[PDB]
With several copies, the nearest count.
Chain A
Amino acid sequence: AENARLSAFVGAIAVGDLVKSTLGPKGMDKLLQSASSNTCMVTNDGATILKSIPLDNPAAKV
């Protein structure tokens, strides 16, 4: 019960700290490097970032 509310609320906090500034030219970015295929994407919006990163957190499904 202690870690149930913690790990659920921090699901968007861990990878979302960089996208909080997305609005405005000063927004921080995030780099997603694939393990193979020589692919990657650089964006300040969490849309593509969240869908392309699998997570075991059940709160990530929402």
Chain B
Amino acid sequence: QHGLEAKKSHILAARSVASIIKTSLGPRGLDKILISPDGEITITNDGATILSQMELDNEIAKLLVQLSKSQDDEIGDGTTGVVVLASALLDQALELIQKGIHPIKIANGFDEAAKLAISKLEETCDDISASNDELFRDFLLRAAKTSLGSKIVSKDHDRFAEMAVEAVINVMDFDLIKMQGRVGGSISDSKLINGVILDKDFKCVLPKEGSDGVKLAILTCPFEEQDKFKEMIDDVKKAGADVVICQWAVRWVGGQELEHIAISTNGRIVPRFQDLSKDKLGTCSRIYEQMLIIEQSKETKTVTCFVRGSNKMIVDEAERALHDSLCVVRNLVKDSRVVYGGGAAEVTMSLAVSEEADKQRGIDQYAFRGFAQALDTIPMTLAENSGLDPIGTLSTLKSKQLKEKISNIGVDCLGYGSNDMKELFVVDPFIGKKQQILLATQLCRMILKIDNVIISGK
């Protein structure tokens, strides 16, 4: 099959995966059960990880692999509906290709219309770096609380956010920091230490001659019989090192985990037995079990979080949210430009192209209006999950935002009685909305150009 009929047998399948994660967007999402071909069971309410690993036939969903590995790593916040957001521009184009419109006319129509709404974002853009450290830190507390974490952390994010913000301030001028967690405890019982988490065990180290250091020793090569065995051990105690780390007393340390110990202690790895010296020893406060607790008295570049939860799935969901939280906060402090998300930013760009559609007119008149209707379907996803009428609520909000130029009032993702995102302190990165709404046109460039699909043999 070739031609327009072949394009409908593939591209139209994107509406199937869009309705799968449609109900899972935002805090109102529902837990969906997924089964991998290998037999593993994955249950989560985040649609970004659902479509990340899946077994499908049509290649129209295979283009989402580069989208999932990007938005989750670059931002992570609001990435649950990135496929629905990307299909929103496609669903409007599916009605245009039925009219006989050329794909480039559709691609250039959505590309220029998305650039006109950037000027509207600059008018409503704010800066969180211009305020003091009190307001800048408080904005990081409610940024991921009302948006990012959708599981159990709605009320309790104050514990996970405060531990995440303090980790950012310590290293402020995450790839060099290893973070993990063990199943147990609760949300508010999580502990924070300066160092790297060491799961391997051997007890208490007393203060040495130096202030706040153990003079830690790390030897990769094992001692190499009984005469040299006890002789090399006494050489470790010459510098006052009670704890020794060797591959073959802490033993069996991983390759990547061993380097994080030297990074936090600012030490060196001693391959031989003749290179042991006080200059090659790392600096660590003490090592004890409270899993050994590695503490650092002086401020270092390694600060990790230990996730605790009552369920084994909470540890996986809370830790993954922290990986995305470190990415959002990284872009907020680096990029001073910020916007108010949570339904306000998507509707903001819809009214900009709506007013510019009547100015250009021409053949792009209905093309610009379709780009406005494509952005209007994004809040319709959160409207059904919150119980609000998608057509009725937006028709009222577009009328209120017509008289008042402030676009912050809009659909609330939390479902509370406050429709103002500025009142709820919902702040999203400006580069985040750029990598979601604007970058989605780049993904549509591959979909709109689909014409004939070549299927080879075995």
A interface vs B, CB < 8 Å?
A: 58-59, 61-62
Contact = CB atoms under 8 A, between A and B. Distances in A.
Which are the 3 A-B pairs with shortest beta-carbon distances?
A: A58-B41, A58-B33, A59-B33
A62 to B, nearest CB: 7
Interface residues of B, number: 4
7 contacts: A58-B33, A58-B35, A58-B41, A58-B43, A59-B33, A61-B41, A62-B43
A59 B41 CA distance: 10
Nearest to A59: B33
Contacts of A58: 33, 35, 41, 43
A58 B35 CA distance: 9
Contacts of A59: 33
B437 to A, nearest CB: 35
Interface string B162-198: 0000000000000000000000000000000000000
A44 to B, nearest CB: 28
A13 to B, nearest CB: 14
Interface in B30-44: 33, 35, 41, 43
A41 B217 CA distance: 57
Contacts of B33: 58-59
Nearest to B41: A58
Contacts of A61: 41
Nearest to A57: B33
A62 B41 CA distance: 11
Nearest to A62: B43
B44 to A, nearest CB: 12
Contacts of A62: 43
A59 B35 CA distance: 11
A58 B43 CA distance: 9
Among B33, B35, B41, find the residue whose CB has the most chain A CB atoms closer than 10 A. Answer: B33
Contacts of B35: 58
A62 B32 CA distance: 12
B213 to A, nearest CB: 49
Contacts of B41: 58, 61
A11 to B, nearest CB: 8
B58 to A, nearest CB: 25
A58 B41 CA distance: 7
